[PDB]
Amino acid sequence: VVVVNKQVLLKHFIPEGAPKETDMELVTTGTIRLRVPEGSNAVLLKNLYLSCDPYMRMRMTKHEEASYVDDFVPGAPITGFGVGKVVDSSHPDFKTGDYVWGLIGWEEYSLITKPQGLFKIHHTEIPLSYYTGILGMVGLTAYVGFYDICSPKKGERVFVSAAAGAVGQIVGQFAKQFGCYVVGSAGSDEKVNLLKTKFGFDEAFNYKKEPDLTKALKRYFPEGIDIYFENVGGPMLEAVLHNMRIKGRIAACGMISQYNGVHNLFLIVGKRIRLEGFLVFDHYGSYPEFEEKVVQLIKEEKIKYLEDIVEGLENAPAALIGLFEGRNVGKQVVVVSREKGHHHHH
Amino acid sequence: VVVVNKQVLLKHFIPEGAPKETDMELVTTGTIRLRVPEGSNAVLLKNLYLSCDPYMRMRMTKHEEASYVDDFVPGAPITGFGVGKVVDSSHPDFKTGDYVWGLIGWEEYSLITKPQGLFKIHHTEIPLSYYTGILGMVGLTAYVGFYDICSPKKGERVFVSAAAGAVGQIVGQFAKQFGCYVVGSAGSDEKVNLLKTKFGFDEAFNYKKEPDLTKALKRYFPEGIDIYFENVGGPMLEAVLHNMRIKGRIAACGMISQYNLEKPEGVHNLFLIVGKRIRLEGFLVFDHYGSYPEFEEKVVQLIKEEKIKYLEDIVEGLENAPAALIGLFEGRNVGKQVVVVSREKGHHHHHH
Ligand SMILES: NC(=O)c1ccc[n+]([C@@H]2O[C@H](COP(=O)([O-])OP(=O)(O)OC[C@H]3O[C@@H](n4cnc5c(N)ncnc54)[C@H](OP(=O)(O)O)[C@@H]3O)[C@@H](O)[C@H]2O)c1
Ligand SMILES: NC(=O)c1ccc[n+]([C@@H]2O[C@H](COP(=O)([O-])OP(=O)(O)OC[C@H]3O[C@@H](n4cnc5c(N)ncnc54)[C@H](OP(=O)(O)O)[C@@H]3O)[C@@H](O)[C@H]2O)c1
Ligand SMILES: COc1cc(/C=C/C=O)ccc1O
């Protein structure tokens, strides 16, 4: 049994600046046998869904010394988080018909030879695509960032940049449900309005239509900010610092403003601010409890979640690109292949 | 019974910029009564020593929104940290002959109406001047920032800037004795040699003499920096950031390179904070007076056992205080800057 296997490859490395669709290429002639090798310690996956995540951009650029994650290889498939089904296994922990999530290939089928970086999916009542984000890497990020790095108290005043992004939207809800005052910022009036209507943010604003970020935060935060969940960085951070309260905390998840400086750092001393970067890579020990908490929320309908869904691998390169441009409304997902039988969608 | 009471006053609020002598004025006509007001709850001090501290400059500028500390008032005496003797008292916890340290006037005698924010000195055997730095506010800063903010572990690689100053020279010794590798920067060869010889730092470097701070740190930290005790701010900070290890910590104690700039340096590589999982944490010694006792016990014993070294830079007479404060931002001070206002009755102590 030998089948077609479409692939998406890094065409070439790219310099400083912005990725483009043409940095990738779809190849359709390749094939793959539908068993694992004898004597292997591997899992063969039919790839169902793929996440486009902002961090992927970094991996298109060549690094002499190892950044946290290895660079993509020219002529080799793009990889990143996704969800898959075991077509075959020669590793004990995974059986034919199991569903998993983790780093897989941007292709129809992945022979994973490092199976220990996969996680079996225990709730199949939930749409599998959620394990690309809310129940995946993205949710875990929100969860660790917020509960751990921000040390929040019932009553504190929370600001979240890229609030309409996948992490941001989950942070915002965790925080409102913690008894916090929550304000997010975004790139669209469409998204500002989702933050308030769908996601239950107390206020929200479009950063692009604000000529003074510092005064912008002032209107929303008359007594200052306690907790900045930071996805953006740059002049946004300057403005947050200006507006931060005694003993404020900044969780430095990302600085997306910087992928494709700050002048008032000294305010950290006299306001006794804690600024701390964190990486969800270091925190997989918290997954299982994180999983049960967020599963309960969904079943209970105490959390809302929006996915931006694209259909088919060949659509993956533009979706990834749109992500960088803020074209995604909700967590960007690509459907490589839907598993058979069932939700409904509009 | 009335005496002469010299005072240094703030003449005018100043703009963003460097301060100058002529921002303060000496006034020698003033007089003071040597008994607290009747019906008061107060302590009159004869002031013996004053500390020159960098945060003092910020107070010379008007601020519309309150900071941690209140501005100076023009035409009112400058105030800061010092050491005084109780001359008279209508407050029970303070008696005549008691020596104290706290916030006092830049003057010969101060009538303290909030005696609650005074510390009585229990160890009069140690030179009183130490309670302006090592056993005062400054010593506690080193203690809290290093032992608490830095979360150090044996073997860690520690970088301290303004390492030959009041705070840094102490932090380095804490760090050395904690079992850490310790490197400092200072603004001269004199300082550098002090760091290596007197203070036991593993390495030191004259930062004014490095064309590349990033590469300078790379020389001393071939495996990178675990902990950085931030006294300085500015491009040293970025150079540290580039050189910092995974899970590195930065205790933002102060950023003195910035205090006299109308326009502050931008730091450009904060992003590293993410992939290196760094904590950059500011703190204020004012919120930590709770720690004093454990700290005082620990440090008085170190001093008594000569297990910690300490250099003061002494300037004689209240009159030389303005120039001494100004000298801090050019790094004239070599050790902790102290001004001797009036040296207590009873010293029989030699120096060079
Ligand atoms: N540290 C970790 O372990 C970890 C793990 C996962 C994710 N993250 C980080 O969390 C952040 C958001 O993640 P996500 O997956 O939830 O992303 P996302 O929101 O699904 O997508 C990126 C969003 O960022 C905003 N954006 C794009 N370019 C921008 C610019 N130049 N200036 C300001 N905003 C811009 C856009 O929204 P607007 O319409 O709001 O502009 C866009 O929708 C990223 O910084 C990412 O690197 C960190
Ligand atoms: N957060 C708190 O609670 C707290 C409490 C006390 C002190 N502090 C801070 O801790 C730091 C150290 O204070 P200290 O009392 O120990 O002062 P200090 O080091 O005894 O005196 C100041 C020294 O800073 C250095 N310096 C001056 N201008 C500089 C510049 N433009 N660039 C680089 N270095 C410069 C000079 O030494 P060089 O010869 O090396 O240039 C100068 O001798 C200060 O930044 C102060 O604000 C904070
Ligand atoms: C201006 O910020 C500072 C405050 C202090 C004193 C802090 C006491 O808790 C010292 C140096 C500074 O730069």
Coordinates of N, CA, C and O in Angstrom, one line a residue, chain A residues 40-168:
Chain A
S40 N 12.1 -0.4 13.6 CA 12.0 1.0 13.9 C 11.5 1.3 15.3 O 11.0 0.4 16.0
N41 N 11.6 2.5 15.8 CA 10.9 3.0 17.0 C 10.1 4.3 16.6 O 10.4 5.4 17.0
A42 N 9.1 4.1 15.8 CA 8.4 5.2 15.0 C 6.9 5.1 15.0 O 6.3 4.1 15.2
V43 N 6.3 6.3 14.8 CA 4.9 6.3 14.5 C 4.6 7.0 13.2 O 5.1 8.0 12.9
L44 N 3.8 6.3 12.4 CA 3.3 6.8 11.1 C 1.9 7.6 11.3 O 1.0 7.0 11.9
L45 N 1.9 8.8 10.8 CA 0.8 9.7 11.1 C 0.1 10.0 9.8 O 0.8 10.3 8.8
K46 N -1.2 10.0 9.7 CA -2.0 10.7 8.7 C -2.3 12.1 9.4 O -2.9 12.2 10.4
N47 N -1.8 13.1 8.7 CA -1.9 14.5 9.3 C -3.3 15.1 9.0 O -3.7 15.2 7.8
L48 N -3.9 15.5 10.1 CA -5.3 15.9 10.0 C -5.4 17.5 9.9 O -6.0 18.0 9.0
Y49 N -4.8 18.1 10.9 CA -4.9 19.6 11.0 C -3.5 20.1 11.4 O -2.7 19.5 12.2
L50 N -3.3 21.4 10.9 CA -2.0 22.1 11.2 C -2.3 23.5 11.6 O -3.2 24.2 11.1
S51 N -1.5 23.9 12.6 CA -1.6 25.2 13.2 C -0.6 26.2 12.4 O 0.5 25.7 12.2
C52 N -1.0 27.4 12.1 CA 0.1 28.4 11.8 C 0.3 29.2 13.0 O -0.7 29.7 13.6
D53 N 1.5 29.3 13.5 CA 1.8 30.0 14.7 C 2.9 31.0 14.4 O 3.7 30.8 13.6
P54 N 2.8 32.2 15.1 CA 3.7 33.3 14.8 C 5.2 32.9 14.9 O 6.0 33.2 14.0
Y55 N 5.6 32.1 15.9 CA 7.0 31.7 16.1 C 7.7 31.0 14.8 O 8.9 30.9 14.8
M56 N 6.9 30.6 13.9 CA 7.4 29.8 12.7 C 8.3 30.7 11.9 O 9.3 30.2 11.3
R57 N 8.0 31.9 11.8 CA 8.7 32.9 11.0 C 10.2 32.8 11.3 O 11.1 32.6 10.4
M58 N 10.6 32.9 12.6 CA 12.0 32.8 13.1 C 12.7 31.6 12.5 O 13.9 31.7 12.3
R59 N 12.0 30.5 12.2 CA 12.6 29.3 11.7 C 12.9 29.3 10.2 O 13.5 28.4 9.7
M60 N 12.5 30.3 9.5 CA 12.8 30.5 8.1 C 14.2 31.1 7.9 O 14.7 31.1 6.8
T61 N 14.8 31.7 8.9 CA 16.0 32.4 8.9 C 17.2 31.6 9.5 O 17.0 30.9 10.5
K62 N 18.4 31.7 8.9 CA 19.6 30.9 9.3 C 20.3 31.4 10.5 O 20.7 32.5 10.6
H63 N 20.5 30.5 11.5 CA 21.2 30.9 12.8 C 22.4 30.0 13.0 O 22.3 28.8 13.2
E64 N 23.5 30.7 13.1 CA 24.8 30.1 13.4 C 24.8 29.3 14.7 O 25.2 28.1 14.8
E65 N 24.4 29.9 15.8 CA 24.1 29.3 17.1 C 22.7 29.0 17.3 O 21.8 29.6 16.8
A66 N 22.4 27.9 18.0 CA 21.0 27.4 18.2 C 20.1 28.3 19.0 O 20.3 28.5 20.2
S67 N 19.2 28.9 18.3 CA 18.0 29.5 19.0 C 17.3 28.4 19.7 O 17.7 27.2 19.4
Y68 N 16.3 28.7 20.5 CA 15.5 27.7 21.2 C 15.1 26.5 20.4 O 15.2 25.3 20.8
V69 N 14.6 26.8 19.1 CA 14.2 25.8 18.2 C 15.1 25.9 16.9 O 15.5 26.9 16.4
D70 N 15.4 24.7 16.4 CA 16.2 24.5 15.1 C 15.5 25.3 13.9 O 14.3 25.4 13.9
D71 N 16.4 25.7 13.0 CA 15.9 26.3 11.8 C 15.3 25.3 10.8 O 15.7 24.2 10.9
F72 N 14.4 25.8 10.0 CA 13.9 24.9 8.8 C 15.1 24.6 7.9 O 16.1 25.4 7.9
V73 N 15.0 23.6 7.1 CA 16.0 23.1 6.2 C 15.4 23.3 4.8 O 14.3 22.8 4.5
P74 N 16.0 24.2 3.9 CA 15.7 24.3 2.5 C 15.6 22.9 1.8 O 16.4 22.0 2.0
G75 N 14.6 22.7 0.9 CA 14.3 21.4 0.3 C 13.6 20.4 1.3 O 13.1 19.4 0.8
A76 N 13.5 20.8 2.6 CA 12.8 19.9 3.5 C 11.4 20.5 3.9 O 11.3 21.7 3.8
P77 N 10.5 19.6 4.2 CA 9.1 20.1 4.6 C 9.2 21.0 5.8 O 10.0 20.9 6.7
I78 N 8.3 22.1 5.7 CA 7.9 22.8 6.9 C 7.4 21.9 8.0 O 6.6 21.0 7.7
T79 N 7.7 22.2 9.2 CA 7.1 21.5 10.4 C 6.5 22.5 11.3 O 6.9 23.7 11.3
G80 N 5.6 22.0 12.2 CA 5.1 22.9 13.3 C 3.9 22.1 13.9 O 3.6 21.0 13.4
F81 N 3.3 22.6 14.9 CA 2.2 21.9 15.6 C 1.0 21.5 14.6 O 0.7 22.2 13.7
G82 N 0.5 20.3 15.0 CA -0.7 19.8 14.3 C -1.3 18.6 15.0 O -0.9 18.2 16.1
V83 N -2.3 18.1 14.3 CA -3.0 17.0 15.0 C -2.9 15.9 13.9 O -3.1 16.1 12.8
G84 N -2.7 14.6 14.4 CA -2.7 13.5 13.5 C -3.2 12.2 14.0 O -3.5 12.0 15.2
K85 N -3.4 11.2 13.1 CA -3.9 9.9 13.5 C -2.8 8.9 13.1 O -2.2 8.9 12.1
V86 N -2.6 8.0 14.1 CA -1.6 6.9 13.9 C -2.1 5.9 12.8 O -3.0 5.1 13.1
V87 N -1.4 5.8 11.7 CA -1.8 4.8 10.7 C -1.1 3.5 11.0 O -1.5 2.4 10.6
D88 N 0.0 3.6 11.8 CA 0.9 2.5 12.1 C 1.9 2.8 13.2 O 2.4 4.0 13.2
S89 N 2.2 1.9 14.1 CA 3.2 2.2 15.1 C 4.1 1.0 15.4 O 3.7 -0.2 15.3
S90 N 5.4 1.3 15.8 CA 6.3 0.4 16.3 C 7.0 1.0 17.6 O 8.0 0.6 18.0
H91 N 6.2 2.0 18.1 CA 6.5 2.5 19.5 C 5.4 2.1 20.3 O 4.2 2.4 20.0
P92 N 5.7 1.5 21.5 CA 4.7 1.0 22.5 C 3.5 2.0 22.7 O 2.3 1.5 22.8
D93 N 3.7 3.3 22.9 CA 2.7 4.1 23.5 C 1.6 4.5 22.6 O 0.6 5.1 23.0
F94 N 1.7 4.2 21.3 CA 0.8 4.7 20.3 C 0.3 3.5 19.5 O 1.1 2.7 19.0
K95 N -1.0 3.4 19.3 CA -1.6 2.3 18.6 C -2.4 2.8 17.3 O -2.9 3.9 17.4
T96 N -2.5 2.0 16.3 CA -3.3 2.3 15.1 C -4.7 2.8 15.5 O -5.3 2.2 16.4
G97 N -5.1 4.0 15.0 CA -6.4 4.6 15.3 C -6.4 5.7 16.4 O -7.4 6.4 16.7
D98 N -5.3 5.8 17.2 CA -5.0 6.9 18.1 C -4.8 8.3 17.4 O -4.3 8.4 16.3
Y99 N -5.2 9.3 18.2 CA -5.1 10.7 17.8 C -4.0 11.3 18.6 O -4.0 11.1 19.8
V100 N -3.2 12.1 18.0 CA -2.1 12.8 18.7 C -1.8 14.3 18.2 O -2.2 14.6 17.1
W101 N -1.2 15.0 19.0 CA -0.7 16.3 18.6 C 0.7 16.6 19.0 O 1.2 16.0 20.0
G102 N 1.3 17.4 18.2 CA 2.8 17.7 18.5 C 3.3 18.3 17.2 O 2.6 18.6 16.3
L103 N 4.6 18.4 17.1 CA 5.3 18.9 15.9 C 5.2 17.8 14.8 O 5.8 16.7 14.9
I104 N 4.5 18.1 13.7 CA 4.5 17.1 12.6 C 4.9 17.9 11.3 O 5.2 19.1 11.3
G105 N 4.9 17.1 10.2 CA 5.3 17.7 8.9 C 4.2 18.4 8.1 O 3.0 18.0 8.3
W106 N 4.5 19.3 7.3 CA 3.5 20.0 6.5 C 3.3 19.2 5.3 O 3.7 19.6 4.2
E107 N 2.6 18.1 5.4 CA 2.5 17.1 4.4 C 1.3 16.2 4.8 O 0.8 16.4 5.8
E108 N 0.9 15.2 4.0 CA -0.2 14.3 4.3 C 0.2 13.2 5.3 O -0.7 12.6 5.9
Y109 N 1.5 12.9 5.4 CA 1.8 11.8 6.3 C 3.2 12.0 6.9 O 4.1 12.4 6.2
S110 N 3.3 11.7 8.2 CA 4.6 12.0 8.8 C 5.1 10.7 9.5 O 4.4 10.2 10.4
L111 N 6.3 10.3 9.1 CA 6.9 9.3 9.9 C 7.7 10.0 11.0 O 8.7 10.7 10.6
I112 N 7.2 10.0 12.2 CA 7.8 10.6 13.4 C 8.7 9.5 14.0 O 8.2 8.4 14.4
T113 N 10.0 9.8 14.0 CA 11.0 8.9 14.6 C 11.4 9.3 15.9 O 12.1 8.7 16.6
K114 N 10.9 10.5 16.4 CA 11.1 10.9 17.8 C 9.7 11.0 18.5 O 9.3 12.1 18.8
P115 N 9.1 9.9 18.8 CA 7.7 9.8 19.2 C 7.4 10.4 20.5 O 6.3 10.7 20.9
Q116 N 8.4 10.6 21.4 CA 8.3 11.1 22.7 C 7.8 12.6 22.8 O 7.2 13.0 23.8
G117 N 7.9 13.3 21.7 CA 7.4 14.6 21.5 C 6.0 14.7 21.0 O 5.5 15.8 20.6
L118 N 5.2 13.6 21.0 CA 3.8 13.5 20.7 C 3.0 13.4 22.0 O 3.5 12.9 23.0
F119 N 1.7 13.9 21.9 CA 0.8 13.7 23.0 C -0.5 13.1 22.5 O -1.1 13.6 21.5
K120 N -1.0 12.1 23.2 CA -2.1 11.3 22.7 C -3.3 12.2 23.1 O -3.3 12.9 24.1
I121 N -4.4 12.1 22.3 CA -5.6 12.9 22.6 C -6.6 12.1 23.3 O -7.0 11.1 22.8
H122 N -7.0 12.5 24.5 CA -7.9 11.7 25.4 C -9.3 12.1 25.3 O -10.2 11.3 25.7
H123 N -9.6 13.3 24.8 CA -11.0 13.7 24.6 C -11.3 13.9 23.1 O -10.9 14.9 22.5
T124 N -11.9 12.8 22.5 CA -12.2 13.0 21.1 C -13.7 13.5 20.9 O -14.0 13.8 19.8
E125 N -14.4 13.7 22.0 CA -15.7 14.4 21.9 C -15.5 15.8 21.5 O -16.3 16.4 20.8
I126 N -14.3 16.4 21.8 CA -14.0 17.8 21.4 C -13.4 17.8 20.0 O -12.7 16.8 19.6
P127 N -13.7 18.8 19.2 CA -13.2 18.9 17.8 C -11.6 18.8 17.9 O -11.0 19.4 18.7
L128 N -11.1 18.0 17.0 CA -9.7 17.6 17.1 C -8.8 18.9 16.8 O -7.7 19.0 17.4
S129 N -9.3 19.7 15.9 CA -8.6 21.0 15.6 C -8.2 21.8 16.9 O -7.1 22.4 16.9
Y130 N -9.0 21.8 17.9 CA -8.7 22.5 19.2 C -7.3 22.1 19.7 O -6.6 22.9 20.4
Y131 N -6.8 20.9 19.5 CA -5.5 20.5 19.9 C -4.4 21.1 19.0 O -3.2 20.8 19.3
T132 N -4.8 21.9 18.0 CA -3.8 22.7 17.4 C -3.6 24.0 18.3 O -2.4 24.4 18.4
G133 N -4.6 24.5 18.8 CA -4.6 25.7 19.7 C -5.1 25.7 21.1 O -4.3 25.5 22.1
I134 N -6.4 25.9 21.4 CA -6.9 26.1 22.7 C -6.4 24.9 23.6 O -6.1 25.2 24.8
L135 N -6.4 23.7 23.1 CA -6.0 22.6 23.9 C -4.6 22.1 23.6 O -4.2 21.0 23.9
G136 N -3.9 23.0 22.8 CA -2.6 22.7 22.4 C -1.6 23.6 23.1 O -1.8 24.1 24.2
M137 N -0.5 23.8 22.3 CA 0.6 24.7 22.6 C 0.1 26.1 23.1 O 0.5 26.7 24.1
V138 N -0.9 26.7 22.2 CA -1.4 28.0 22.3 C -2.1 28.2 23.7 O -1.8 29.1 24.5
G139 N -3.0 27.3 24.0 CA -3.7 27.4 25.3 C -2.7 27.2 26.4 O -2.7 28.0 27.4
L140 N -1.8 26.2 26.3 CA -0.9 26.0 27.4 C -0.1 27.3 27.7 O 0.3 27.7 28.9
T141 N 0.3 28.0 26.6 CA 0.9 29.3 26.7 C 0.1 30.3 27.5 O 0.6 30.9 28.5
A142 N -1.1 30.5 27.1 CA -2.0 31.4 27.8 C -2.0 31.0 29.3 O -1.9 31.9 30.2
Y143 N -2.2 29.7 29.6 CA -2.4 29.2 30.9 C -1.2 29.5 31.8 O -1.3 30.0 32.9
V144 N 0.0 29.0 31.4 CA 1.3 29.3 32.1 C 1.6 30.8 32.2 O 1.9 31.3 33.4
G145 N 1.7 31.5 31.1 CA 1.8 32.9 31.1 C 0.9 33.6 32.2 O 1.4 34.4 33.0
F146 N -0.4 33.2 32.3 CA -1.2 34.0 33.1 C -1.2 33.7 34.5 O -1.1 34.5 35.4
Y147 N -1.4 32.3 34.8 CA -1.6 31.8 36.1 C -0.3 31.8 36.8 O -0.2 32.0 38.1
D148 N 0.8 31.5 36.1 CA 2.1 31.5 36.7 C 2.9 32.8 36.6 O 3.0 33.5 37.6
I149 N 3.3 33.2 35.4 CA 4.2 34.4 35.3 C 3.5 35.7 35.8 O 4.2 36.5 36.4
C150 N 2.2 35.9 35.6 CA 1.6 37.2 36.0 C 1.1 37.2 37.5 O 0.7 38.3 38.0
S151 N 1.2 36.1 38.3 CA 0.8 36.1 39.7 C -0.4 36.9 40.0 O -0.4 37.8 40.8
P152 N -1.5 36.7 39.3 CA -2.6 37.6 39.4 C -3.4 37.5 40.7 O -3.4 36.5 41.4
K153 N -4.0 38.7 41.1 CA -4.9 38.8 42.2 C -6.3 39.2 41.7 O -6.3 40.1 40.8
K154 N -7.4 38.6 42.2 CA -8.8 39.1 42.1 C -8.7 40.6 42.3 O -8.2 41.0 43.4
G155 N -9.1 41.4 41.3 CA -9.1 42.8 41.4 C -8.2 43.6 40.5 O -8.4 44.8 40.2
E156 N -7.1 43.0 40.1 CA -6.0 43.6 39.3 C -6.4 44.0 37.9 O -7.4 43.5 37.4
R157 N -5.7 44.9 37.3 CA -6.1 45.5 36.0 C -5.2 45.1 34.9 O -4.0 45.4 34.9
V158 N -5.7 44.3 34.0 CA -5.0 43.5 33.0 C -5.0 44.1 31.6 O -6.1 44.3 31.0
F159 N -3.9 44.3 31.0 CA -3.9 44.7 29.6 C -3.2 43.6 28.8 O -2.2 43.0 29.2
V160 N -3.7 43.3 27.6 CA -3.3 42.2 26.7 C -3.1 42.8 25.4 O -4.1 43.2 24.7
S161 N -1.9 42.9 24.9 CA -1.7 43.2 23.4 C -1.9 42.0 22.5 O -1.9 40.8 22.9
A162 N -2.2 42.2 21.2 CA -2.5 41.1 20.2 C -3.7 40.4 20.8 O -3.8 39.2 20.6
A163 N -4.5 41.1 21.6 CA -5.6 40.4 22.3 C -6.5 39.5 21.5 O -7.2 38.7 22.1
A164 N -6.6 39.8 20.2 CA -7.5 39.0 19.3 C -6.9 37.8 18.8 O -7.5 36.9 18.2
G165 N -5.5 37.7 19.0 CA -4.8 36.6 18.6 C -5.1 35.4 19.5 O -5.9 35.6 20.5
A166 N -4.6 34.2 19.2 CA -5.1 33.0 19.8 C -4.8 32.9 21.3 O -5.6 32.6 22.1
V167 N -3.5 33.3 21.6 CA -3.2 33.3 23.1 C -3.9 34.4 23.8 O -4.5 34.2 24.9
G168 N -3.9 35.6 23.2 CA -4.5 36.8 23.8 C -5.9 36.6 24.1 O -6.3 36.9 25.3

